[PDB]
Amino acid sequence: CNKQNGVKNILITFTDCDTQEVIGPISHEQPDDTLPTYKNCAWTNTALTNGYVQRSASNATMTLPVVRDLRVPLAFYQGCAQVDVQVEKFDGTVMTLTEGAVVEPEESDGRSVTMNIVASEIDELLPPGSL
Amino acid sequence: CNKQNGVKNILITFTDCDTQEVIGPISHEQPDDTLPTYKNCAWTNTALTNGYVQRSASNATMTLPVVRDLRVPLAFYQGCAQVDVQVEKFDGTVMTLTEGAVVEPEESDGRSVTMNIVASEIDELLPPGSL
Amino acid sequence: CNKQNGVKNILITFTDCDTQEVIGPISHEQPDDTLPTYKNCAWTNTALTNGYVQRSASNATMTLPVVRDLRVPLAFYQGCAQVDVQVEKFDGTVMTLTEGAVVEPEESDGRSVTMNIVASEIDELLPPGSL
Amino acid sequence: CNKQNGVKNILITFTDCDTQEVIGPISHEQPDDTLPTYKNCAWTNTALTNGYVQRSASNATMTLPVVRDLRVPLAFYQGCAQVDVQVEKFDGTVMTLTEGAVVEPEESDGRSVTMNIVASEIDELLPPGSL
Amino acid sequence: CNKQNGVKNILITFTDCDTQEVIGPISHEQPDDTLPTYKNCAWTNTALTNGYVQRSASNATMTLPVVRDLRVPLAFYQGCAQVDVQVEKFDGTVMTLTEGAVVEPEESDGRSVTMNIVASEIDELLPPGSL
Amino acid sequence: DALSDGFVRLCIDPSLNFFGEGCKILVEGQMTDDGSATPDAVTCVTSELDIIERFGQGSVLTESLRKVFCTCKSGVSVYALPREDAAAGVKAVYTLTIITLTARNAGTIGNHLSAGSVNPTPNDYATVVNECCFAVYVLSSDDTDWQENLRDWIRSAWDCSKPQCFGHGYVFNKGTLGQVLADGDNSAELSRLALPTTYPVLPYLTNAAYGALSACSTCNNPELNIQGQTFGLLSCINMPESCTPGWTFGEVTQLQANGFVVSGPSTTNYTSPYIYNDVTNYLRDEKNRPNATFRDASSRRLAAATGVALAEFLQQFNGLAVFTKNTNIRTGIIGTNPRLMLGKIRKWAQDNVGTLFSEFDNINEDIQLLTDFEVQPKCVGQPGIFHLNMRYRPPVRGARINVNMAPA
Amino acid sequence: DALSDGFVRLCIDPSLNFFGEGCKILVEGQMTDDGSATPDAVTCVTSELDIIERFGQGSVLTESLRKVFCTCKSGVSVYALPREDAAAGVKAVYTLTIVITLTARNAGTIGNHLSVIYTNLGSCTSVTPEGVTVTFAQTTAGSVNPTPNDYATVVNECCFAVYVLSSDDTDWQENLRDWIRSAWDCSKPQCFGHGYVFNKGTLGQVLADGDNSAELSRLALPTTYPVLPYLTNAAYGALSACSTCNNPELNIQGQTFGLLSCINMPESCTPGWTFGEVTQLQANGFVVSGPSTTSGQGNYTSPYIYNDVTNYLRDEKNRPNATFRDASSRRLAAATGVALAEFLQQFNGLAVFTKNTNIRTGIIGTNPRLMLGKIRKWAQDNVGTLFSEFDNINEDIQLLTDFEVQPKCVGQPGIFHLNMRYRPPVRGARINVNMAPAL
């Protein structure tokens, strides 16, 4: 059935900045039913008076709750490494993020982590048939 | 099973900052179903404009709820003594913290205390099979 | 677009006064949402008694916060070289400044620099439809 | 990642003006999120009327908040000794200062000292690819 | 801990300049989280052109917030008496001061007083391991 | 003496190289018998002091290499291909009436100073330079046979059968209008630098200077066009000022039309000539008469750089895993399916815009990845192999202005 | 003393062995008489210092062991099988005319492969003094190599994962091949293994040395190969062993998995093999190796291998038998067989009901259908680490008692019959990018 909302594959690649060693792309599993959340548009608007809008540069963010891999140190998930995350949905859409960084790491219990990944841009694949 | 989430051992060693008396290590038990929660990455990140990130020094923290031992004064659990806490999970992960300090004590009822321990760095044992 | 307020293109040309190398025009990026701030009229009026004002020669001044370019020395942004600045807003107008000078530099951290540019005149594009 | 803003190494060398004893270079640690600020241009441009400026001799200043070392007297941080500071950022930039003097000492609590260093010139490294 | 910032002991000895009555040393107390501040270097520097520094004589100042002792008159804390203060920080550093005089007393509520102690020189202990 | 005792070793040699650098350039020219370099052997040259002994004194290759070092202070690592003079080499004979002058190398290379014949035709690139990859090839003579052979070998270097080894060549053609046009070849692997009959400076010197300038300008920036008085100025070459132009304006226009690089004076004392255009010679496609896909020299460098960068980026997929068709990837397995590969390729192409491409028109159409077991007809596909297509678009640069003043 | 009285016992020494063996490898080659190792007897080596004591210095075996240790920092245990030089001591003799006469330290054709190069020309720092004309043209070549053929006695029932041979003797190679083939004998419990050997020479003769050996990995080496062939062979074998070990799926390919870091070879402009016959070697089951960075002159470069395949090109009769082409399939099959043998061991001694399939309460037993269900569950649990997704689980796994697979009164109680048809995982090999600089 095409009418299905979910995530099919999650791939994450870690690149330690100190030693330039690349790990991955390993596959990951969701901890619960909360889907990854995106924000593609790289510009943030602000409301002004009578229809005007102040346009300013900002980031493309992404929130990724996943289950940590027992072969990967926990510090790689909390901003000590550069992430290369790529997520595929059940409807065919693919989210590709490269050269990302974790901004505000909350404390985790050692099984489930939530990344606030920031990047210059995020690529949309748009399964066939566009515009 | 190899598929289990939970803690197995929690050892805390208390060192008095006045008389240099060392106590422990003493095993402890959870007061509830909440697991100890970790933050390993010693650097913190701040979101900037268009993908940039500002790196600044930070701490490796831990939240640890435990049932206090009746042989140890309550003041030792609220920042008047050093703590050398060490936790081992069921899946083999062992997190080691030494020369820690309790930052923000809270009103405990006399049985269960919640530590917020801040230390320079936290070590991970990362059960066999890595990277 | 329709009624947006902001900057899209910033061009700065650096001209050394002691060796006469010219670098630019190089594109630049804003560090935050603080737009450049302008003063075109080259005269300042001092209020005098009974509706009278005093006309004295003044300077067309420009304020420009930009992100430092890693291939350009920082001293170029602090008054050790002439600046030729040209910026385009989202609405379509273009402000052109030629043969500028930085008057009151302040200490910067090496990534974000605020320029206080002085000149003799500043040009305006005034998108089609004037007076 | 190369999309990172922050310092990586800070080295200070103290040269006492009485006994000509040299101490350093010693690594130092930042006290808080504030980054050191620089002013490289040795001239100042006092604005004049109708586009003219008045160039005059000045100093290349610097502001350096650091955590003092317990092996160095606090008086060395407040103008009774010379300083040879060298700051390296995460993007490869290196700022080198020599024959500097702390110009305006300020009340310090004994842990964190903020320096206002005045020197004839400051040299940039400008990671490869320049002008 | 050896990684703690703060004050441990404050000792003040009062000697009135009229009756030459010596009271102390008395252990004092901190009114809030603000720690005493220092300027140990006895010479002051001022900015000149092209890296020059004009050296001038100054004092080794001290700011000291303490809690008034009900057995001691408040006028002693506000400039009618000499103070020989000695406060030791948690890391072992000792700031020994003798023959100090408060310069600019201000309104106090009767419990907390903020010293502005001036002196010719201040001693420093520099816990073992120096230069 | 001083600090120099054991630790720290000093040396005051006034002729020293700096670093190995990159962006290797190959120059080929005849060498005199006085030189010591082995004929038909490619070697690296580090400084200008040892050229005079290795390639002789007054030889064409020595002057070309000296001019290359003059033009380029840094950024290239030159390579030289010395050639011994022809066995049946007639020497060039000059006569001055006031002194009898003779060239130092036999052949026609001595007749362009203001007569010898038979130039050596080695045709040995396949063995002397087998797998070395040179960005710029420099030829120091007007012999059409050498130019044809070098063009043929460079074309063979881009052949699709064997792994590509990209490069470009610079040659000169000095003579009258009729002579220079006949030399023109449709191949874009060479850039014919046209020179007038009354050109004072020796042609090979100018050709070597132009090649060195092109290589040192581009190097890691394979988009800059050698053009104008700022980017295409040969500061080393000096020629006396003259009131008679070497080429008429219409002559320049016709030479510009037929893929010829035209030089011009700077003042119209000695003046340094500067290049007008960086166009290659790509008049026609295999049958398409107009084709601008390879007119500019920047096109070849951009194509080579894009190819090399894309090949390097794809190397991560070397035996990683491919869960094509099959199902979704399990947990812990390190792999990827064709959809994710296409997404990553699209992301790489999008991030590379602004330095190698220009915006794009429809990235969902220009980029197209396809598994091989379905690109070919039924039962023709084979497993464990992919396909990829890419219609990238090169950047644009400025051109003529057409100003029109009018008073009132 | 310094508070070291009792509890603590310091043993400071710059030579220790750490790992707990696992994923064994065997190296067999000639040995100098200086060493004290017992001839024709497999021995276990523990470190690098003892190598010179056991097998001497300068021999092929000690150099191979050094390369294996360099390539494999940890994760495997190294076993060595010393061999004495042949009776006919025809030691190869070289000549370094400047005149220095060079003689190989072990007799036979093993000493006939040695190239000496000189970093002449510019090379910046390598400016040579005037003169010094180095020449290298050999004087005579050795011959006669040992043919032990005593595997059945020296190594009787010790299963080895990787066999390393340090000689080009075709008789020795075929003897090792025959023994390893005999290790997969259905009449005996198997010792699954795989041997790596090299075949140096021109393209015409190397194809003749090859055959349908699925249990050998022939490494093609050109005539102008600088590095000593046995060093490269040992490095390749050690890299394969340590890369797979407990992960018997990885293909040894690319600049990330197929890099022989320890081996270094001088830069060159003639790329050894030529592209057309590189493809020719690729087609007929030969392991092709190349330089990491061809470019031009400069410094040394590490070698670089391709096509981690075996020399298996033919089925029993037909041509296209790809079931054993890749070397990864070999280790996958061995691991699956061993793991399945371990898994079924739980049924040994168990009670089995076939006629009345109603197990009484409290009885510890099972029936064939429950065994089939458990086997299917085990097979499904190994998808992604040993098998593909799967074809069709109903028909490719069959459990049958011998009663219904044999005719009247031919069966016997307690004997089953299990048939499995798995498929190995899939991996990518080529890209075939097509660019178009359209305007």
mmCIF file of C-alpha atoms in Angstrom, chain F residues 13-117:
data_model
loop_
_atom_site.group_PDB
_atom_site.id
_atom_site.type_symbol
_atom_site.label_atom_id
_atom_site.label_comp_id
_atom_site.label_asym_id
_atom_site.label_seq_id
_atom_site.Cartn_x
_atom_site.Cartn_y
_atom_site.Cartn_z
ATOM 1 C CA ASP F 13 72.901 28.259 -0.660
ATOM 2 C CA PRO F 14 71.514 30.981 -2.987
ATOM 3 C CA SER F 15 69.843 28.458 -5.351
ATOM 4 C CA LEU F 16 67.216 26.399 -3.532
ATOM 5 C CA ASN F 17 63.838 24.882 -4.349
ATOM 6 C CA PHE F 18 60.890 25.232 -1.963
ATOM 7 C CA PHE F 19 58.431 22.316 -2.209
ATOM 8 C CA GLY F 20 57.116 19.677 -4.579
ATOM 9 C CA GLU F 21 53.849 21.592 -5.095
ATOM 10 C CA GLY F 22 51.586 20.251 -7.823
ATOM 11 C CA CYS F 23 49.926 20.910 -11.179
ATOM 12 C CA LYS F 24 52.650 19.292 -13.260
ATOM 13 C CA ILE F 25 53.453 20.768 -16.682
ATOM 14 C CA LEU F 26 55.378 19.072 -19.497
ATOM 15 C CA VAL F 27 57.477 21.052 -21.985
ATOM 16 C CA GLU F 28 59.003 19.425 -25.071
ATOM 17 C CA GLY F 29 61.784 21.026 -27.085
ATOM 18 C CA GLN F 30 65.037 20.339 -28.868
ATOM 19 C CA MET F 31 68.242 20.205 -26.826
ATOM 20 C CA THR F 32 71.800 21.005 -27.843
ATOM 21 C CA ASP F 33 74.595 18.438 -27.763
ATOM 22 C CA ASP F 34 76.224 20.290 -24.849
ATOM 23 C CA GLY F 35 73.454 19.173 -22.497
ATOM 24 C CA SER F 36 73.688 16.071 -20.337
ATOM 25 C CA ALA F 37 70.018 15.043 -20.147
ATOM 26 C CA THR F 38 69.195 11.704 -21.737
ATOM 27 C CA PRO F 39 67.292 12.136 -25.028
ATOM 28 C CA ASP F 40 63.714 10.830 -25.130
ATOM 29 C CA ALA F 41 63.530 10.869 -21.317
ATOM 30 C CA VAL F 42 61.142 12.885 -19.144
ATOM 31 C CA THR F 43 62.644 14.368 -15.976
ATOM 32 C CA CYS F 44 61.708 16.909 -13.319
ATOM 33 C CA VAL F 45 63.367 20.338 -13.233
ATOM 34 C CA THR F 46 63.658 22.091 -9.869
ATOM 35 C CA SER F 47 65.474 25.392 -10.479
ATOM 36 C CA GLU F 48 66.913 27.640 -13.177
ATOM 37 C CA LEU F 49 70.571 27.240 -12.162
ATOM 38 C CA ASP F 50 71.026 23.661 -13.416
ATOM 39 C CA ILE F 51 69.081 24.070 -16.682
ATOM 40 C CA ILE F 52 72.076 25.515 -18.545
ATOM 41 C CA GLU F 53 74.147 22.353 -18.030
ATOM 42 C CA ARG F 54 71.386 19.752 -18.457
ATOM 43 C CA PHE F 55 69.888 21.232 -21.646
ATOM 44 C CA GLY F 56 72.810 23.245 -23.028
ATOM 45 C CA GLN F 57 73.347 26.955 -23.568
ATOM 46 C CA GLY F 58 71.095 28.803 -25.997
ATOM 47 C CA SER F 59 68.943 25.771 -26.797
ATOM 48 C CA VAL F 60 65.249 26.258 -27.533
ATOM 49 C CA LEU F 61 64.202 24.055 -24.606
ATOM 50 C CA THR F 62 66.456 25.978 -22.214
ATOM 51 C CA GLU F 63 64.908 29.314 -23.192
ATOM 52 C CA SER F 64 61.376 27.902 -23.020
ATOM 53 C CA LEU F 65 61.965 26.465 -19.540
ATOM 54 C CA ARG F 66 63.599 29.695 -18.342
ATOM 55 C CA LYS F 67 60.578 31.667 -19.536
ATOM 56 C CA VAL F 68 58.296 29.153 -17.800
ATOM 57 C CA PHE F 69 60.122 29.765 -14.516
ATOM 58 C CA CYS F 70 59.963 33.518 -15.155
ATOM 59 C CA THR F 71 56.188 33.464 -15.641
ATOM 60 C CA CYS F 72 55.557 31.060 -12.741
ATOM 61 C CA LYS F 73 57.093 31.797 -9.359
ATOM 62 C CA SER F 74 55.161 28.941 -7.714
ATOM 63 C CA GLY F 75 52.298 26.507 -8.184
ATOM 64 C CA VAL F 76 53.660 24.085 -10.805
ATOM 65 C CA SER F 77 56.193 21.259 -10.998
ATOM 66 C CA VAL F 78 57.611 21.412 -14.514
ATOM 67 C CA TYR F 79 58.613 18.355 -16.536
ATOM 68 C CA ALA F 80 61.003 18.457 -19.489
ATOM 69 C CA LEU F 81 61.292 16.157 -22.514
ATOM 70 C CA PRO F 82 64.653 16.892 -24.161
ATOM 71 C CA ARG F 83 64.996 15.957 -27.823
ATOM 72 C CA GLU F 84 68.283 15.501 -29.657
ATOM 73 C CA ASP F 85 68.810 17.334 -32.933
ATOM 74 C CA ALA F 86 68.063 15.627 -36.236
ATOM 75 C CA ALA F 87 70.766 13.459 -37.778
ATOM 76 C CA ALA F 88 70.138 15.082 -41.175
ATOM 77 C CA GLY F 89 69.564 18.464 -39.560
ATOM 78 C CA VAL F 90 70.275 21.497 -41.724
ATOM 79 C CA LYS F 91 71.429 24.451 -39.641
ATOM 80 C CA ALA F 92 69.776 27.864 -39.837
ATOM 81 C CA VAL F 93 71.986 30.452 -41.551
ATOM 82 C CA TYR F 94 71.701 34.208 -41.009
ATOM 83 C CA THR F 95 73.726 37.067 -42.484
ATOM 84 C CA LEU F 96 73.899 40.606 -41.089
ATOM 85 C CA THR F 97 75.414 43.511 -43.031
ATOM 86 C CA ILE F 98 76.901 46.436 -41.112
ATOM 87 C CA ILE F 99 78.233 39.397 -38.918
ATOM 88 C CA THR F 100 77.263 35.858 -39.920
ATOM 89 C CA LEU F 101 74.791 34.340 -37.452
ATOM 90 C CA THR F 102 73.791 30.687 -37.099
ATOM 91 C CA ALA F 103 71.215 29.097 -34.823
ATOM 92 C CA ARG F 104 72.365 26.747 -32.074
ATOM 93 C CA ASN F 105 69.897 23.991 -33.049
ATOM 94 C CA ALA F 106 69.403 22.492 -36.499
ATOM 95 C CA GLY F 107 65.968 22.661 -38.112
ATOM 96 C CA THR F 108 63.373 25.275 -38.992
ATOM 97 C CA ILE F 109 63.241 26.580 -35.403
ATOM 98 C CA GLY F 110 66.043 29.048 -36.159
ATOM 99 C CA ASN F 111 64.274 30.804 -39.046
ATOM 100 C CA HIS F 112 61.848 32.792 -36.845
ATOM 101 C CA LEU F 113 64.309 35.448 -35.633
ATOM 102 C CA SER F 114 64.168 39.032 -36.892
ATOM 103 C CA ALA F 115 67.933 28.350 -43.508
ATOM 104 C CA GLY F 116 67.641 24.964 -41.835
ATOM 105 C CA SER F 117 65.022 22.301 -42.461
#
